[PDB]
From a paper:
ClpC1 is an ATP-dependent homohexamer that is responsible for substrate recognition and unfolding. ClpC1 is a 95 kDa caseinolytic AAA+ protein with an N-terminal domain (NTD) and two nucleotide-binding domains (D1 and D2). The essential ClpC1–ClpP1–ClpP2 proteasome complex of Mtb has recently become the focus of several drug-discovery campaigns. The NTD (amino acids 1–145) has been studied extensively to determine the most critical residues for the binding of ClpC1 to several natural cyclopeptides with potent anti-TB activity.
Since single mutations at sites Leu92 and Leu96 of ClpC1 caused a reduced binding affinity for ECU, the crystal structure of an engineered double mutant was solved to investigate the mechanism of resistance. Since the L92S mutation had a lower affinity for ClpC1-NTD, it was chosen for the double mutant. Superposition of the structures of ClpC1-NTD-L92S/L96P and the ECU complex resulted in an overall r.m.s.d. of 1.12 Å or of 0.71 Å without the three N-terminal residues. The N-terminus of ClpC1-NTD-L92S/L96P is a curved loop in approximately the same orientation as in the RUF-I complex and apo forms. Looking into the changes at the mutation sites, a distortion (‘kink’) in the helical backbone induced by proline and the missing nitrogen bond acceptor of the carboxyl of Ser92 was observed. This C=O bond protrudes out of the helix axis and is at an approximate hydrogen-bonding distance from NH2 of Arg4. Accordingly, the L96P mutation apparently does not have a significant effect on the length of helix 6 as both the ClpC1-NTD-L92S/L96P and ECU complex structures terminate this helix at residue 97, while some other structures terminate at position 98. This subtle alteration is significant in relation to the binding of ECU, as the conformation of Arg4 may be important for the three previous residues of the N-terminus (Met1-Phe2-Glu3) to adopt the extended ‘ECU-binding’ conformation for site 1. However, in ClpC1 the L96P mutant confers ECU resistance, as do the L92S and L92F mutations. As shown in Fig. 3(b), it was observed that the double mutation L92S/L96P introduced a kink in helix 6 and replaces a hydrophobic residue (Leu) with a more polar Ser.
Numbering used by the authors: 2 to 155
The structure:
């Protein structure tokens, strides 16, 4: 979890809370996606919205599939191997873009690249294909960079 930002670490805490609220006995890709969409002003959320995807629409489609469990375990809810894979893919996606940090945008790209999980299935069906979201990530950051250079020009 070394290079995780405050916001990228809060998405994993909210994943544990989302699993607990639904009384699930596991943290899957679904809970990392439900964690992510709390951060409405981050690059991940802004990337999806700029592709005409709505956050509460993502929530409804994830929740319809995964349902509700019997009872959350009393201790830590265990991450699934694919949930672990999403987090590993997120930290390999950051360097490839030339980023010195793991942000909400890398977790979104991790969820999509994982490919097999509920998160990837929901996002792909809403038109959140990997290369399309990557391009949107890059354009948003380049777009933010230009606005802040205008600011900087006092």
């Amino acid at each position: 979890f070394e290079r995780f930002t405050d916001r990228a670490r809060r998405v994993v805490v909210l994943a544990q809370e989302e699993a607990r609220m639904l009384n699930h006995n596991y943290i899957g890709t679904e809970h990392i996606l439900l964690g992510l969409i709390h951060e409405g002003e981050g690059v991940a959320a802004k990337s999806l919205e700029s592709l005409g995807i709505s956050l509460e629409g993502v929530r409804s489609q994830v929740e319809e599939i995964i349902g509700q469990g019997q009872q959350a375990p009393s201790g830590h809810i265990p991450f699934t191997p694919r949930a672990k894979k999403v987090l590993e893919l997120s930290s390999r996606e950051a360097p490839q873009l030339g980023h010195n940090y793991i942000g909400t945008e890398h977790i979104l790209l991790g969820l999509i690249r994982e490919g097999e999980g509920v998160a990837a299935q929901v996002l792909v069906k809403l038109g959140a294909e990997l290369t399309r979201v990557r391009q949107q990530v890059i354009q948003l950051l380049s777009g933010y960079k230009l606005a802040a250079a205008l600011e900087h020009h006092h």
